[PDB]
Amino acid sequence: IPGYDYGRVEKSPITDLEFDLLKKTVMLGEKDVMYLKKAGDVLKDQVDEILDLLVGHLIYYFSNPDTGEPIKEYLERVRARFGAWILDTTSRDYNREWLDYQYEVGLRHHRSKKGVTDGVRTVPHIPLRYLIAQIYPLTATIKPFLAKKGGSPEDIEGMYNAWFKSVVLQVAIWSHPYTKENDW
Amino acid sequence: IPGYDYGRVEKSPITDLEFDLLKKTVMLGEKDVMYLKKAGDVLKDQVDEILDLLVGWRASNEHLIYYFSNPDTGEPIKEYLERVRARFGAWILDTTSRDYNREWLDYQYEVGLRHHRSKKGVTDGVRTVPHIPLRYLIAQIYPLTATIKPFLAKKGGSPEDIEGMYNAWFKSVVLQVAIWSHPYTKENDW
Amino acid sequence: IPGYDYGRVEKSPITDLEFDLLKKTVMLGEKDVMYLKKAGDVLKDQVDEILDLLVGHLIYYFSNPDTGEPIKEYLERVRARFGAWILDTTSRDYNREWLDYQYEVGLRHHRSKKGVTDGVRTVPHIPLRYLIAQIYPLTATIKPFLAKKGGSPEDIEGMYNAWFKSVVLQVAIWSHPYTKENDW
Amino acid sequence: IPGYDYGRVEKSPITDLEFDLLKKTVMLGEKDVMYLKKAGDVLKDQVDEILDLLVGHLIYYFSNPDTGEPIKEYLERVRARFGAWILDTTSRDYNREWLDYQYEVGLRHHRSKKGVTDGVRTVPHIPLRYLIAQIYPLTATIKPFLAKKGGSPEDIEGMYNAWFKSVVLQVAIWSHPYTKENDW
Numbered sequence: 080i081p082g083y084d085y086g087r088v089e090k091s092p093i094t095d096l097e098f099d100l101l102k103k104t105v106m107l108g109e110k111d112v113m114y115l116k117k118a119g120d121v122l123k124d125q126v127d128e129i130l131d132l133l134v135g136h137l138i139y140y141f142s143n144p145d146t147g148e149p150i151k152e153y154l155e156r157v158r159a160r161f162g163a164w165i166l167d168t169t170s171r172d173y174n175r176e177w178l179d180y181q182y183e184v185g186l187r188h189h190r191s192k193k194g195v196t197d198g199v200r201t202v203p204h205i206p207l208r209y210l211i212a213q214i215y216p217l218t219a220t221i222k223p224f225l226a227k228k229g230g231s232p233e234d235i236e237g238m239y240n241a242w243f244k245s246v247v248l249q250v251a252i253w254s255h256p257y258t259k260e261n262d263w
Numbered sequence: 264i265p266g267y268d269y270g271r272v273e274k275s276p277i278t279d280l281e282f283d284l285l286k287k288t289v290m291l292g293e294k295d296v297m298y299l300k301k302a303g304d305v306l307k308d309q310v311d312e313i314l315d316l317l318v319g320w321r322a323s324n325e326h327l328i329y330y331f332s333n334p335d336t337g338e339p340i341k342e343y344l345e346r347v348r349a350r351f352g353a354w355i356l357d358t359t360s361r362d363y364n365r366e367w368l369d370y371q372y373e374v375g376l377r378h379h380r381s382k383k384g385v386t387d388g389v390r391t392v393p394h395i396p397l398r399y400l401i402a403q404i405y406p407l408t409a410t411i412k413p414f415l416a417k418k419g420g421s422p423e424d425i426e427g428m429y430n431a432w433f434k435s436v437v438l439q440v441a442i443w444s445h446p447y448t449k450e451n452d453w
Numbered sequence: 454i455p456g457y458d459y460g461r462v463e464k465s466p467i468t469d470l471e472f473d474l475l476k477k478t479v480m481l482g483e484k485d486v487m488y489l490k491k492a493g494d495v496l497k498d499q500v501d502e503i504l505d506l507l508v509g510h511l512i513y514y515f516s517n518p519d520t521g522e523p524i525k526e527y528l529e530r531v532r533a534r535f536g537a538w539i540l541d542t543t544s545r546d547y548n549r550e551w552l553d554y555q556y557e558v559g560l561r562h563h564r565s566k567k568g569v570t571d572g573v574r575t576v577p578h579i580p581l582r583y584l585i586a587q588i589y590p591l592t593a594t595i596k597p598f599l600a601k602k603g604g605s606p607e608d609i610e611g612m613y614n615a616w617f618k619s620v621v622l623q624v625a626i627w628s629h630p631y632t633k634e635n636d637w
Numbered sequence: 638i639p640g641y642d643y644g645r646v647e648k649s650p651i652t653d654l655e656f657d658l659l660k661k662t663v664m665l666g667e668k669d670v671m672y673l674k675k676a677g678d679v680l681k682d683q684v685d686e687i688l689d690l691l692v693g694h695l696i697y698y699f700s701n702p703d704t705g706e707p708i709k710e711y712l713e714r715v716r717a718r719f720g721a722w723i724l725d726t727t728s729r730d731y732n733r734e735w736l737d738y739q740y741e742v743g744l745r746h747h748r749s750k751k752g753v754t755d756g757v758r759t760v761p762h763i764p765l766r767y768l769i770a771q772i773y774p775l776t777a778t779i780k781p782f783l784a785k786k787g788g789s790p791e792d793i794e795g796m797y798n799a800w801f802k803s804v805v806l807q808v809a810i811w812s813h814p815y816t817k818e819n820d821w
């Protein structure tokens with residue numbers, strides 16, 4: 080998967096303790112790690128059906144800004160990495176390697192690295208306000224996929240809440256290159 | 264409620280269209296507005312029980328008390344916790360029952376400045392931790408969303424009712440934090 | 454100097470803009486900052502003489518209230534901090550650090566923290582009316598010391614007026630814990 | 638100066654006595670404190686010239702590790718703090734405040750906080766061996782600047798040796814987060 084750089088990016092300037100504190104704040108515990116891995120099982124085999132809901136109004140950020148035309152090759156390549164992110168979110172251990180890639184992913188929404196990974200000339204920057212807003216649809220979208228394979232509501236809620244915790248935590252990490260020095 | 268300034272704050276530097284776009288991004292529709300108002304009914308009469316989970320000076324609040332504290336001594340400011348708790352109590356019902364209009368937007372922006380070094384501590388005249396880091400505001404989206412759901416369900420009803428109320432609350436919390444981030448983010452990055 | 458906490462106190466609940474507006478109102482400009490620093494030169498070597506005029510209708514507030522007896526220790530320790538305040542007033546940059554200490558000093562006249570710094574059992578509270586009244590003697594007392602080393606009357610007036618501006622500004626800050634919520 | 642945190646950092650886990658013993662071992666006495674302050678006079682007005690020799694052999698540690706490309710903003714911001722360190726080394730009183738900042742500076746070479754201050758993704762860790770080796774060039778580089786303004790060789794040697802003592806003492810402090818528990 081071109082540009083997919085999990086495990087191959089530089090050290091994010093967030094410390095291990097600050098990360099641990101962040102996981103504590105979103106209440107990401109051992110239970111959620113289990114629920115996440117279980118979401119990975121439930122979602123593994125529905126990724127394309129998830130991808131069709133999300134990536135294949137914010138089309139604009141996949142576009143050439145001067146013409147407003149979307150970049151097919153940008154959408155395809157990001158979609159593929161997003162497909163991997165679905166399973167990275169569920170199945171990776173949320174360790175320094177994970178933190179570093181989440182930070183990378185945040186830089187790629189940011190003017191710092193947006194468009195660079197796919198070599199496209201695109202909207203340079205995704206405003207923070209939309210990254211945070213997106214927490215809702217990207218959280219809520221997953222839940223029908225978590226439930227389709229049945230099980231217990233407490234299973235579905237545990238998986239769902241763990242996913243929710245991860246999305247928030249990710250966006251919390253991503254905000255670091257968006258926020259003023261000292262305000263993060 | 265001292266410091267509670269809903270309807271009495273200055274114009275936030277966010278336009279009406281950017282706000283509307285933000286509500287559209289979190290998918291805050293007329294269904295959610297209805298669900299929010301219905302959460303207001305379900306929650307109004309459980310606020311103190313909600314407040315005890317989140318904010319008091321005899322609450323249950325966790326790794327967060329520090330931001331209610333004197334930084335040099337680490338001691339929490341009882342009067343800060345009580346006054347904020349009262350405003351938080353009103354915020355619960357403001358979140359459910361207010362119309363999400365310019366007046367609302369302006370107060371959400373105010374509330375974000377009050378977590379920010381710009382106005383934290385000023386409202387209660389306390390000498391406190393000057394600034395709540397953005398990372399924690401965003402992280403808090405989860406516990407402040409998830410905490411509400413048992414209270415939405417206690418009075419029974421339909422799961423689709425509870426989910427509608429719950430999701431609307433979720434949308435509001437995200438939208439609020441999205442607004443609050445504006446004084447935290449670099450010029451042009453919001 | 455025990456209790457002398459310049460640079461080591463918490464954030465006063467006064468904003469940077471409200472402080473700047475306050476300096477604007479007392480007309481504290483770049484000229485006064487220069488004149489203040491020059492007062493610092495003129496006064497540093499007369500502090501003890503200054504202190505003997507001021508601290509070594511006030512005495513009651515240095516006293517045990519039940520017996521009316523003054524607390525030697527309290528007077529000695531405050532005098533020392535006052536000695537430092539003379540030079541802090543002239544030589545510090547009037548920035549957030551300064552503002553925070555002025556606010557601290559106001560709390561120490563207030564029932565909020567009077568007596569705490571020196572661990573004394575004393576008159577709990579200095580009434581605001583006397584803090585404001587004291588603006589005059591604490592301003593006017595300094596002027597002979599500003600003039601003793603000679604120079605130009607315009608020098609002496611510039612130093613004197615800057616000192617006057619600072620004393621007012623300080624008391625203006627101190628009033629915040631004395632005034633009703635919303636009335637400051 | 639962004640990130641420049643002298644006087645604003647937490648308590649280093651080195652005691653006052655262990656610090657005093659360290660100054661005793663490098664033979665940092667009252668004479669050196671005087672010589673240091675005199676170096677401060679001699680160097681204050683040559684800092685940029687000094688900075689151009691050192692920071693604007695080990696560029697890699699200012700770099701992105703994956704690409705080896707140096708981070709201009711990292712070099713700029715560190716250079717500015719280094720400029721302040723030159724004058725902090727000469728002019729500060731070597732007290733607890735100073736010790737705490739030296740410890741901070743050592744953590745910033747260490748994997749514990751390297752890159753965090755400037756939010757850069759960089760080489761995570763400066764190996765201890767290079768911190769110690771650097772004692773020589775960072776000591777010897779200063780001496781022509783100490784001599785340029787003339788004076789006595791005994792003046793230049795006193796300033797030079799005091800600088801030498803400080804650099805060693807600093808690195809001695811910095812080694813604490815690098816060394817095994819109990820071996821420092």
Ligand code: HEM
Pocket residue numbers: 082083084137140141157160161164165184187188192193194195196197205209210211213214217246249250
């Ligand atoms: C309104 C908000 C958002 C918009 C408009 C947006 C759009 C984009 C775009 C254009 C890219 C590719 C950026 C580049 O490298 O040039 C991208 C990458 C990605 N986004 Fe977003 N995004 C948003 C928020 C989010 C959120 C909250 C998540 C949650 C994780 C997310 C997940 C991803 C993933 C997984 C990728 C691919 C990352 C990779 O390269 O591995 N996005 N998104």
Ligand code: HEM
Pocket residue numbers: 266267268327328330331347350351354374377378382383384385386387395399400403404407436439440
């Ligand atoms: C989604 C996240 C959050 C929500 C929904 C929320 C809600 C609120 C509300 C409603 C208020 C009072 C507003 C008013 O004065 O009218 C408030 C104030 C406050 N909250 Fe938060 N809060 C959040 C995050 C946080 C975090 C992470 C902390 C860290 C402990 C925190 C600590 C405080 C403090 C110290 C105040 C007093 C602020 C001040 O000095 O004015 N809050 N919060």
Ligand code: HEM
Pocket residue numbers: 456457458511514515531534535538558561562566567568569570571579583584587588591620623624
């Ligand atoms: C009638 C008016 C005043 C009375 C009775 C008074 C008395 C006192 C007392 C009892 C203290 C010790 C407070 C404590 O317990 O810490 C004190 C501290 C002090 N006062 Fe006043 N004061 C008055 C007005 C002023 C004014 C106008 C100034 C001008 C700046 C001033 C300057 C100071 C200073 C510098 C200190 C030491 C602050 C520190 O702790 O560093 N006072 N005064």
Ligand code: HEM
Pocket residue numbers: 640641642695698699715718719722742745746750751752753754755763767768769771772775804807808
């Ligand atoms: C081979 C050895 C060294 C290398 C490769 C190196 C490189 C660096 C780097 C990359 C930084 C930025 C660190 C950060 O991310 O915060 C830095 C900061 C700094 N270095 Fe070194 N350094 C070395 C040894 C030394 C020595 C012996 C000194 C003597 C004091 C010194 C003085 C400084 C100073 C003063 C700063 C800025 C401290 C501050 O943030 O205030 N370095 N150096």
